[PDB]
Design a protein around this nucleic acid. Structure first.
Ligand SMILES: [Mg+2]
Ligand SMILES: [Mg+2]
Ligand SMILES: [Mg+2]
Ligand SMILES: [Mg+2]
Ligand SMILES: [Mg+2]
Ligand SMILES: [Mg+2]
Ligand SMILES: [Mg+2]
Lengths: 55, 104, 136, 84, 175
RNA sequence: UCACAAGGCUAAAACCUUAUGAAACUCCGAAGGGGCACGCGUUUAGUCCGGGAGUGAGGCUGCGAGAGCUAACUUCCGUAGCCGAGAGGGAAACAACCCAGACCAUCAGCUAAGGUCCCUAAAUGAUCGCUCAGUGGUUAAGGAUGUGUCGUCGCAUAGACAGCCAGGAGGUUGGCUUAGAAGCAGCCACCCUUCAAAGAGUGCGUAAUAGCUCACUGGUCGAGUGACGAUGCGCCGAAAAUGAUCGGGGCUCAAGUGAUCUACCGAAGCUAUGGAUUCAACUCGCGAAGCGAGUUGUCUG
RNA sequence: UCCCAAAAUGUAACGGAGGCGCCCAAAGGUCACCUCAAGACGGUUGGAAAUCGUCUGUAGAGCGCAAAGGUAGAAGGUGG
RNA sequence: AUCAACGGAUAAAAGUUACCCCGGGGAUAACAGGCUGAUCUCCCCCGAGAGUCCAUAUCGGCGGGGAGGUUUGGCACCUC
RNA sequence: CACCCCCGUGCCCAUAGCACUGUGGAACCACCCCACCCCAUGCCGAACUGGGUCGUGAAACACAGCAGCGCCAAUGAUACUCGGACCGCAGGGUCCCGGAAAAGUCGGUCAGCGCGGGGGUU
């Protein structure tokens, strides 16, 4: 699953900032290839709105 | 009333004691004096009175207790918990106790 | 109007009507479209309006009752405690709740007595008819 | 000195520190002595290897694993399903 | 009356002039969705003491009687309908509208006819043998006259689900 | 449990049908939250000993409550964020709201929130609509043949709704009530005749009469006409003290406003190129740590 | 103690209510036994309740106190 | 041990200042401004009824919706 | 657990309960029977308790019928709500995404599962 940070963590709740950290994203634009497992899929759903998700 | 059975039956603290329980049906003249296992929904020993009462009906007292005590050793049983249904531990049932308390 | 026995004081919160049918007791009703606090005196004002219009008989069902106690500022301060037991009693009305219903009067007779009672109320209302048989 | 009253009526200070509730839950490891419930009456009644203090406190008799049995309110029990 | 689709998500119908529906008996309790406009013109006539056939888009005809309706509280508009599939030989308890005939001899002096029970629950009626109304003559009535349930003429085979000492129609005095 | 609406009923209390309200009511009951195990999977903190502190006046907003008038830029808790200690763009200006977290250099590029007539960067864009009030660019109860669009009853070429000519009853000055009350200051009823039709009666009127017309009927016209409601945009309601204005200019020959679609502008955000720092691992100098240099990743309000 | 208190714990106000500053030699220990409030119908001083009798009866009673939880398989009531 | 001001300063303790003094505070009141608008001022809806008759020529019970910021306040934001 | 039934005793403690109705006596159990003692009634063998039959199966119990009441209870829909995003000066409201009631309706039920001992298939 291709993930990219499109929105800033500033002004977003602690947990959502903590999730974006767990996904390995540090800057807006940071894109990475991601695992298709309940835990990794769950993190991505938890910051769904801050990310541009491919497939 | 029916509250007396459940009373003694509740004060018979099952698994904490470790012991097995000894039930009695002296409401009628066919006393059932059973050895019942705590955990398993099992009855181990037991000794009735219907199967040859020995003339006596209430005097059969020690007879059913002696029968039981002997049947206990045949299985190994040495540790017990007596449960006087609603029976005020005095005559018919007080003998059955001593009959088993001296027979093992 | 007021209640007979109680506790003295209360609070405040709101969300869409819980227990108000459409056609119970009467033939035509008066329903709230906005949330409010119906003062004892506004109900009394509506009742007398309807009672006068329907001269003799008595077929007015006031399905709402003022049970909530409201408080007041003696004159000044704040350097004291919680206040004014005896200010006014209220009925928490939420949109949908049937406040009043009439019987033994025509569509036209009822249209007006409700049009009149509406002018005395602190909220917008709608006049209604039958076809609601939910649970009996 | 006045003819009115001692202490002035209509108050609203007064309340108290207080604690309570469940301490150890369904699927937790317990050492013997470990308090698993603080309560008022007998919300939860004792079971296997679960004792009951003077103040209805439910504690572990022997080490193991906490198990909750919910028969339908009133008939509530905490037990220890010994690990070994 | 002609039904269309049946999905669990009502997002497709909600925006349009459609009302969600359900029909049950004990053997088939399928999902539904019909027209608001068509339902209303028909229901306003029928109610609980009437029935119409519902033919879902696939050619499947079934007779059903209305059990309960649930409308919006802020609006007058119905938002869901519960239909009950008809047997043919024996049904359930039905709510029948109680009506009045002829001017009372109690309504003259200063009285008024108070229909205390707007709809009556009736045990063992018979399906398609359901009376669309329940007319009660009131000319015999004076001021202080209570007509109980066990004083009402039911139409052939029907029995009463309510207590026979319970007031259905009364003539009320002035003020 | 306490409060409470309509009726039954009985000697009220109870009980029955219908119908409700609850912070200190609950037959029930979520979403969520918390403990623990696992990590089945991504991340990078944690804990423990010891040195040095500072801080114990917070502020606003959303949400959940109390106090208060369901006031305050009010007060007091809970909760999330920002300001505090936060520069940069946007919101005319403007701690806080929207976007976004500044290592340094560039006369490079893409975007965010916001924007694209001219002041002022970038479409006086494209399509179907709506609103002519400058609404947009001060709020309400209430009020309105304002325009747009869907609907629900009805009368209708067996000739309607409106204008036009003629008529409009007789009992009966319905009774009662009264100083009178005669279609019209107030109760009961709204029954009857004649018929193309006329209600013991709508509004006005004099002191009651009369008067002047409508409900209902016919002739001539000739076509749709009327009443509730729904909902979009607009109208009235709308009076304050130095000079006025939506930031201005100005805009409907939309630069207003609903829906859709690209394109461009736009920051200290992301990117390009160079360069420095922090930590870390990977090389080597040196008798050993330890510190140099050296790449690669990473960091720097 | 309850409510506020936002279904964990905790949480403020000169917010809403109300108690405590002792008592019990048995109102403790243990072993036995007992089972409540109320209502209908029937009866001596009586008669609205009382002492008696049958029929309904999770408890609508009690628990030295305030309230909350809890509780009749007793924590209620009686005795050695 | 009402050390009850209940983490309890001494074994041992009241007032007054317009004769007053110093260090501070806009952390905090009086004036004024500000925010608010209960109160205050005004206006509007409805139409009981008053008006020989006729609600509206005048007047408007019970009730309802706003405007203003000139009152008494609330709050405590710059200014001690 | 060859099979029927009964007496004890469990797990389960209303889908197990109540009402109404029917069958069972001399196997078992129930009343019953007498009591001076053992033992017992703040009075009374009511209950405990002792000795025992007969007489009956009345009462109690066990078992069976039944859907009048209890109890259990969907599907659909709504309320509410985590997260995303807005409207209104406000009380208050809306949209997207999962989660998801309560009450009601359809309907389901006069349970299911062990261990021991006693008596039957003449
Ligand atoms: Mg308003
Ligand atoms: Mg001031
Ligand atoms: Mg239920
Ligand atoms: Mg979600
Ligand atoms: Mg939300
Ligand atoms: Mg807002
Ligand atoms: Mg949803």
């Amino acid at each position: 699953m291709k993930i990219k940070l499109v929105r800033s963590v500033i002004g977003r709740p602690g947990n959502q900032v903590k999730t974006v950290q767990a996904l390995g994203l540090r800057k807006i634009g940071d894109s990475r290839e991601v695992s298709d497992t309940p835990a990794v899929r769950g993190m991505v759903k938890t910051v769904k709105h801050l990310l541009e998700v491919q497939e | 009333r029916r509250k007396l059975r459940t009373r003694r039956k509740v004060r018979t603290t099952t698994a904490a004691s470790g012991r097995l329980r000894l039930s009695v049906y002296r409401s009628s003249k066919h006393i059932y004096a059973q050895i019942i296992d705590d955990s398993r929904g099992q009855t181990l020993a037991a000794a009735s009175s219907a199967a040859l009462k020995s003339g006596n009906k209430t005097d059969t007292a020690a007879a059913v207790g002696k029968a039981l005590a002997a049947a206990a050793a045949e299985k190994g049983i040495k540790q017990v918990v007596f449960d006087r249904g609603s029976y005020k531990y005095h005559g018919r049932v007080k003998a059955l106790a001593d009959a088993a308390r001296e027979g093992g | 109007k007021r209640t007979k026995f109680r506790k003295q004081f209360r609070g405040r919160m709101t969300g869409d009507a819980k227990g108000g049918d459409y056609v119970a007791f009467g033939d035509y009703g008066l329903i709230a479209m906005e949330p409010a606090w119906i003062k004892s005196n506004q109900i009394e004002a509506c009742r007398i309006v309807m009672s006068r219009h329907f001269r003799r008989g008595g077929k007015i069902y006031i399905r709402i009752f003022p049970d909530k106690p409201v408080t007041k500022k003696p004159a000044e301060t704040r350097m004291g405690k919680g206040k004014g037991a005896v200010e006014y009693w209220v009925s928490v009305v939420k949109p949908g709740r049937v406040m009043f219903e009439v019987a033994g009067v025509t569509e036209e007779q009822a249209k007006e007595a409700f049009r009149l009672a509406g002018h005395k109320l602190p909220i917008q209302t709608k006049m209604v008819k039958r076809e609601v048989y939910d649970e009996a | 000195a006045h003819k009115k009253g001692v202490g002035s009526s209509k108050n609203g200070r007064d309340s108290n520190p207080k604690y309570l509730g469940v301490k150890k839950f369904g699927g937790e490891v317990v050492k013997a002595g470990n308090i698993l419930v603080r309560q008022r009456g007998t919300k939860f009644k004792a079971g296997q290897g679960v004792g009951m203090g003077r103040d209805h406190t439910l504690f572990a008799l022997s080490d193991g694993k906490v198990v909750f049995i919910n028969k339908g309110k009133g008939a509530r029990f905490i037990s220890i399903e010994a690990a070994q | 009356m002609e039904l269309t689709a049946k999905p669990r998500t009502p997002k497709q119908k909600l925006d349009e002039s459609m009302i969600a529906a359900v029909a049950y008996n004990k053997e088939n309790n399928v999902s539904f969705a019909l027209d608001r406009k068509a339902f209303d013109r028909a229901f306003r006539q029928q109610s609980t003491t009437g029935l119409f056939d519902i033919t879902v888009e696939g050619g499947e005809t079934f007779p059903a009687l209305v059990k309960a309706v649930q409308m919006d509280k802020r609006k007058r508009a119905p938002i869901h309908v519960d239909f009950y599939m008809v047997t043919y030989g024996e049904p359930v308890e039905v709510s029948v509208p109680v009506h009045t005939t002829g001017r009372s001899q109690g309504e003259v002096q200063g009285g008024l006819v108070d229909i205390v029970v707007h709809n009556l629950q009736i045990v063992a009626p018979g399906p398609r043998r359901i009376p669309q109304e329940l007319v009660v003559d009131v000319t015999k009535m004076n001021i202080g006259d209570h007509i109980t349930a066990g004083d009402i003429k039911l139409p052939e085979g029907c029995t009463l689900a309510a207590d026979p000492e319970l007031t259905v129609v009364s003539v009320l005095p002035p003020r």
